Amino acid sequence: DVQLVESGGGLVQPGGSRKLSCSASGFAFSSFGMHWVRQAPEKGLEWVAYISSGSGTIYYADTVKGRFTISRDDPKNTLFLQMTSLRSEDTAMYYCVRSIYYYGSSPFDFWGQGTTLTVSDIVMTQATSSVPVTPGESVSISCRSSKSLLHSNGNTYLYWFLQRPGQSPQLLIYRMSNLASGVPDRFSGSGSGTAFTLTISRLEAEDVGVYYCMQHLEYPLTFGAGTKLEL
Amino acid sequence: DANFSCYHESVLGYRYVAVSWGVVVAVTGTVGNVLTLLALAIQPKLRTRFNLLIANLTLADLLYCTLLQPFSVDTYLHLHWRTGATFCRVFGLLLFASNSVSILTLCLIALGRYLLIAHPKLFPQVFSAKGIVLALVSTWVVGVASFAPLWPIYILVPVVCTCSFDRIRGRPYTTILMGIYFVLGLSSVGIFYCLIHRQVKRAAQALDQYKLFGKVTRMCFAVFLCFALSYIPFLLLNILDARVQAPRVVHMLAANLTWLNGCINPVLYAAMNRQFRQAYGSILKR
Amino acid sequence: TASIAQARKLVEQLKMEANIDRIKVSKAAADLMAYCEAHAKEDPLLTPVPASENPFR
Amino acid sequence: SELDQLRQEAEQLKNQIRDARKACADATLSQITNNIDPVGRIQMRTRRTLRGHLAKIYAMHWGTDSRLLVSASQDGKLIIWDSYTTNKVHAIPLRSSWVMTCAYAPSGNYVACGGLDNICSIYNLKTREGNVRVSRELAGHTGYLSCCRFLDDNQIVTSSGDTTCALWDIETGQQTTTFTGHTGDVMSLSLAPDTRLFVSGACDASAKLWDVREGMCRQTFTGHESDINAICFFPNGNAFATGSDDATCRLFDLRADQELMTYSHDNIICGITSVSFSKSGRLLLAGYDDFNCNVWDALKADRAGVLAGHDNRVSCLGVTDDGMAVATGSWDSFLKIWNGSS
Amino acid sequence: TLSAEDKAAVERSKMIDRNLREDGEKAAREVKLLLLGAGESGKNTIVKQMKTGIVETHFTFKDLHFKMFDVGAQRSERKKWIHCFEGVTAIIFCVALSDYDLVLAEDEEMNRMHASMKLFDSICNNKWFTDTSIILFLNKKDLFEEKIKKSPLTICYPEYAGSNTYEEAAAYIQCQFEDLNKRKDTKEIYTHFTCSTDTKNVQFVFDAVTDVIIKNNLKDCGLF
Ligand SMILES: CC(C)CCC[C@@H](C)[C@@H]1CC[C@H]2[C@@H]3CC=C4C[C@@H](O)CC[C@]4(C)[C@H]3CC[C@@]21C
Ligand SMILES: CCCCCCCCNC1=NC(=O)NC(=O)C1
């Protein structure tokens, strides 16, 4: 099976340095671009860094541009984040994320288990932070963006993710309509322009958790604030 | 002071054998070098990493035989430079850049022919996907950055009867430059084209223990005499001639021999290359 | 052994191919003509679309 | 004893089916479609050029979404191209370089390729590991694979050089049907639109129409003088067209059992490597061996276009499922996408 | 210009092009030999000397990599798949020398070496091998030297005005093979007289194909 295990996190002094390793197994690691995406405790997700296939493109977030270094080792199948000048804001959980890009591709499809580090643009409008519901009824989670994600470039680069409690995020919808691999057909995605929605009909008990809308129209990659589904 | 005139008694006949020759290089370089570039631009199959060297060489003398040749065919005809000094200052740079690029491109074609035959596992270890463009731009940033310090001295020399450097002010840097282009212009088109012939003879001489170089030698002589007829007379005259005590007609002979390099190159490197003739055939079939 | 079996299977194959019904060539040609003239507007190589609807500009 | 009377019976009842075909020819396609208007000069232009193959290109198959394609070349490579952006979606290194056909599954999940190794390989395009690897190797032919088409992600019809077509199930790997009856090497097959029949062409100038479920030769079509290299169905499935080495295309009908129209010009001497139909069936695009790709008015049999852009033999061609473009691959290692303008 | 996923797709396609070009150059430095001849003329002897579809043999010698394609098992129609070998480096056509007087089994009226000249005429002036040099192996000549002293060569050759010794007969057979070459300017035939006890046949195919390779590189530079 596909597997990504991260290590290196723990207690550090502020302003220091730390190595984050993501060991990969069971997929063509050289063919996949990789990302780091972190999540502060009881907060949403924010994209940290991106290295391409063959290291031909390296993008950062401006929060960490100049302080973080992302570097892949393909013969060892490892991904590395060298972290310099670690302030107290960088206490989070880090996720090492596969992503492959061609026609009809499913980016961001398998997220790693993440490691915890403790040290001491387009904006996605996801304003409804909690929707209470009971199993069996349809829920519609909505999301709005700063600018439009659809034009004559063809697609609409909105990505719906789901994080169950105690787990990594998991891709539900990519490019606003297309259901991922390993998720049931009750999840639907629709919308137009700046306004999009995720429909969960016939809802079971394992859909409890936080739902995120992400954009992939241009870097940097920005998530929503989250939408919790409970009870 | 500084005058722009050529008139002398020795050159009054030779000017005709210049101008009737000068309309030859202007008419065998504007059809021999545009056909090579049409064969390279139309069919993208023969844009190999070796044939880009022939593209650089046929761009190094299209500049000569299209622009700088008809401006030195009336200077031999009217015996005074009909334009100004600030065009002479750039003619003297372009004329020597369009020869230094051509000479270093010949010295790279000889290495790209020795490598494509003797060590063919090293030809894309040296000429990579953009090591080729590095080797093409290092001909033009050496052809114009070694002749740019000689910018103010590009005067109308009446001994050569062309806008060129003057041979008293150019000392000792320009004789050092011509000696540098001698000791690598002859250690490349002579050493590599003889190691190629040695490899061809050594290959055909191993099929004689299993018993009981005819046109390769002609081509390896045709790409050495047609170089040696062009640049060794000029580079041997204008080095040992400390003063200009040599006559006007021997200087115009040694400088009218470097116009051969803009004619013999579209017939040595295009009309004899099988890829380019096959390209003409594929164009004339399509 | 083999030639008699090959010939009997050949005549059985050709007699079942004889036992088919064949329409007149006028009706089949008119069927092809009607399919061509009933799908002509949906042929971008026959009647070419403008460049706003062409994916291969 | 019995073989002489049996072959005299064979001659007798094939003259019976000859006279039965002769009984139906009330009129030919020419004076029937003599009243309709021609299509004009089909001026088509090259739009993309797919470079990256380093040997002869032997087959291409358009994807059903009319944007992806797969091409096979004898440099050992199967390339999945995005035809809109000229992107190379996938590069598949084959085990046997001598590939002569390639097929794209109508779901887009698989590609099949086969060649001189007599194996039809099935490759999974959409795997969880990210790459493309071999799902199945259909071994069981004793001649070269000359064509292959998918019906499902599971059922695939192949033509071979050992005079047999076959129908395979992929998940078991075994033949579920062996279509026998050709005497020469079978070069091409073409599935019907409803995938219940398929025509086939062989080197003995025969096009056999087979039923896929019953596994029997429904009809047999003659009229060509030499090897039939490529075959293609009309888009409504009630006719098909063959292209043979005698510089002639022909159009047979499944119902009328006979040739209706012949596509031949005296200027053409060479073979025909590929035929395909447009989305309305009005244009038949035959890739000839004189390096061109001619375009025939398939109802009046006058040549209406030429696609001359290759420096070698136009080996494969194909029209998209929506009929936007035409991809021709050739032996000069270059695929070209074509369509016209207003 | 392009979206972020379009640009990462274009970067992926560039990596595909890079691996295609480096694999294509690594394959253009390969020696691809098409193996041809009659059945048991020494083909198994030379394929064990050099170490139902196609049978490819890959080996290496003096840091040069050879692939050799045997299409003897292909009982298909040869006029439909021989252009797949248009562009091989050399054709290794193998002929036994001791079959000048022996007769084929299927017809029992044609000579075996006459069938070898018919096959060499079909291979040599073929339209797909006009530029392909033909290495010509002549095998088991140690039995031919015993067959030439008792049985005369004049059974196969009417217009043979030569001696019945070994070297004159071998030179006559070699010249009669090499004179079927109808395009002698574009290709050249390399001939070898081998046995079962010699060690130097892979060395011969290495030297002959080094000559073919150097002439090909001369023709691609422009020196031809
Ligand atoms: C005044 C003089 C220097 C003018 C010269 C103009 C022309 C010849 C110049 C000189 C340097 C040249 C380039 C040198 C090398 C390459 C790389 C090759 O893969 C394509 C052509 C290209 C990109 C050339 C294009 C023309 C060029 C830009
Ligand atoms: C080899 C180093 C560069 C020297 C260039 C040699 C060829 C010069 N060509 C000239 N051509 C003229 O017509 N007049 C000249 O003065 C010179």
Author numbering:
A (entry chain E): 1 to 120, 137 to 247
B (entry chain R): 6 to 217, 314 to 387
C (entry chain G): 6 to 62
D (entry chain B): 2 to 343
E (entry chain A): 4 to 54, 182 to 354
What do the paper's sentences say?
GPR84 is a unique orphan G protein-coupled receptor (GPCR) that can be activated by endogenous medium-chain fatty acids (MCFAs). The signaling of GPR84 is largely pro-inflammatory, which can augment inflammatory response, and GPR84 also functions as a pro-phagocytic receptor to enhance phagocytic activities of macrophages. GPR84 is a Gi-coupled GPCR that has been suggested to recognize endogenous medium-chain fatty acids (MCFAs) but not short- or long-chain fatty acids (SCFAs and LCFAs)7.
To understand the actions of 6-OAU at a molecular level and to facilitate the potential rational development of other, more drug-like, GPR84 activators, we determined a high-resolution cryo-electron microscopy (cryo-EM) structure of the GPR84-Gi signaling complex with 6-OAU. Our structure reveals a completely occluded binding pocket for 6-OAU and a receptor-specific Gi-coupling mode. 6-OAU is an amphipathic molecule with a polar head group and an octylamine tail. The uracil head group of 6-OAU engage in extensive hydrogen-bonding interactions with T167, S169 and R172 in ECL2 and Y692.53 and W3607.43 of GPR84. The amine group of the octylamine tail of 6-OAU also forms a salt bridge with N1043.36. In addition to the polar interactions, the saturated octyl tail of 6-OAU resides in a hydrophobic sub-pocket surrounded by GPR84 residues F1013.33, F1524.57, L1825.42, Y1865.46, Y3326.48, F3356.51, L3366.52, and L3617.44. Structural alignment with the active GPR84 structure showed large rearrangements of these two residues due to the steric effects caused by the octyl tail of 6-OAU. It is likely that 6-OAU activates GPR84 mainly by inducing conformational changes of the Y3326.48-N1043.36 pair, which in turn induce significant displacements of F3286.44 and the cytoplasmic segment of TM6. The C-terminal α-helix, α5, of Gαi is the major interaction site for GPR84. In the C-terminal half of α5 of Gαi, residues I344, L348, and L353 in the α5 and the last residue, F354, of Gαi form hydrophobic interactions with I1223.54, I2015.62, V2055.66, and V3176.33 of GPR84. First, in our structure, the conformation of ECL2 results in a ligand-binding pocket with a size that cannot accommodate LCFAs with 14 or more carbons.
